[PDB]
Amino acid sequence: KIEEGKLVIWINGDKGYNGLAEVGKKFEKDTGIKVTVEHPDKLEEKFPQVAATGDGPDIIFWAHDRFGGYAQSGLLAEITPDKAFQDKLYPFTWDAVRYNGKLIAYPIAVEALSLIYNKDLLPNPPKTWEEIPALDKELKAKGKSALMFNLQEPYFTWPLIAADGGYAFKYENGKYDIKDVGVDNAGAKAGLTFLVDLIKNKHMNADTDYSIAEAAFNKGETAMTINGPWAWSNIDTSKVNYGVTVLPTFKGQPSKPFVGVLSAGINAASPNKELAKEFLENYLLTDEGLEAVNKDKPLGAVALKSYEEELAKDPRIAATMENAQKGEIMPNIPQMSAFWYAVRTAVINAASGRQTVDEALKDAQTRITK
Numbered sequence: 001k002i003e004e005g006k007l008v009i010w011i012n013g014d015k016g017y018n019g020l021a022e023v024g025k026k027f028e029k030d031t032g033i034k035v036t037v038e039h040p041d042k043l044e045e046k047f048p049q050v051a052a053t054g055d056g057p058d059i060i061f062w063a064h065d066r067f068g069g070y071a072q073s074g075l076l077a078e079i080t081p082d083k084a085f086q087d088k089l090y091p092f093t094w095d096a097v098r099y100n101g102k103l104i105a106y107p108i109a110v111e112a113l114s115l116i117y118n119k120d121l122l123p124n125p126p127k128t129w130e131e132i133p134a135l136d137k138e139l140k141a142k143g144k145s146a147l148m149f150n151l152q153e154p155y156f157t158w159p160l161i162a163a164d165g166g167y168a169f170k171y172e173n174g175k176y177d178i179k180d181v182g183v184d185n186a187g188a189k190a191g192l193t194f195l196v197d198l199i200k201n202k203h204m205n206a207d208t209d210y211s212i213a214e215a216a217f218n219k220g221e222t223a224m225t226i227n228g229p230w231a232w233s234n235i236d237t238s239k240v241n242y243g244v245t246v247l248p249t250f251k252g253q254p255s256k257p258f259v260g261v262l263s264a265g266i267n268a269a270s271p272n273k274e275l276a277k278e279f280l281e282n283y284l285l286t287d288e289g290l291e292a293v294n295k296d297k298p299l300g301a302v303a304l305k306s307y308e309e310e311l312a313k314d315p316r317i318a319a320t321m322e323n324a325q326k327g328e329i330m331p332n333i334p335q336m337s338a339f340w341y342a343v344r345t346a347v348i349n350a351a352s353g354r355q356t357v358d359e360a361l362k363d364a365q366t367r368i369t370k
């Protein structure tokens with residue numbers, strides 16, 4: 001059973017659900033329609049379950065890459081924002097919400113990795129990756145290191161590998177070509193080679209992971225790290241006078257980190273599709289709406305141009321958006337799973353010696369296009 005005459009929305013417990021409830025209240029005040037916001041555990045797993053029997057919430061909020069599987073099963077309705085409404089959000093955000101050409105959700109916020117540096121020991125962060133080997137040598141003369149970041153997860157090393165030419169799946173005409181994979185090209189090898197060279201020359205350690213790199217930076221042992229907005233609070237506590245800026249370039253090309261877009265989708269079984277569109281387009285996605293949510297829990301950078309211009313007064317937020325625009329929207333298709341597993345293995349093998357760069361990426365490329 002559906003509901004009709006009301007809206008039930010689902011959003012994770014780590015987002016600003018009280019603020020979203022407040023926009024829901026204004027909605028009821030204006031139109032008279034009731035809006036109920038819920039935040040159940042493991043909601044991203046429950047949705048495909050209940051939605052399959054024609055039940056669940058009218059609207060669901062979650063990273064866009066999850067909507068791919070939902071769209072595949074016909075769980076999400078096709079949205080119809082006109083050209084004028086689409087012009088209100090940054091163009092690249094609409095690419096993260098289409099499946100097989102159809103628009104299946106509204107972009108809300110944008111997230112991506114940035115370069116984080118310690119202002120006290122490094123007032124002027126490097127503009128290029130090539131500069132780092134030398135910067136590390138000067139800093140070591142005082143018992144400090146230049147950079148430390150997670151080398152165990154491919155999500156963190158990919159920005160560098162992608163810089164000069166690497167890509168997961170080719171995107172064109174709003175579609176991904178599962179046959180045009182770019183982890184085996186010249187650019188990718190140049191990027192990984194530079195990464196392996198860093199470890200051989202003793203600038204980084206092949207075993208460094210998330211906790212290890214985070215501690216080094218927060219203790220002031222290393223001058224920089226690479227992380228996302230989910231890590232700022234831990235830095236605030238450490239008391240390090242930190243900065244968040246654009247990632248370094250490689251061979252003159254910007255680093256290209258994967259982008260995650262918080263999005264709002266409409267249950268295909270909902271009899272309240274027009275109510276959902278009214279609420280999402282003219283209440284939530286306004287300076288007033290996103291403001292309400294942001295106050296409760298910060299959204300980071302947002303897709304709405306007008307509000308993003310206001311939030312950008314914060315240099316950390318301005319950085320997140322700059323790195324995201326220079327990055328690669330994470331693919332929402334089934335094969336991306338193969339990509340992750342194949343690339344993880346290659347990076348770890350080339351870093352440990354288990355395999356050379358040329359061979360590691362060659363095998364990865366072979367497994368993914370299988």
Ligand SMILES: OC[C@H]1O[C@H](O[C@H]2[C@H](O)[C@@H](O)[C@@H](O)O[C@@H]2CO)[C@H](O)[C@@H](O)[C@@H]1O
Pocket residue numbers: 153154155156228260340
């Ligand atoms: O390393 C592969 C891994 O990358 C992504 O995970 C990110 C996530 O997107 C970020 O929001 C944050 O949590 O850091 C994660 C890396 O630990 C993909 O989302 C994930 O599916 C993939 O396995």
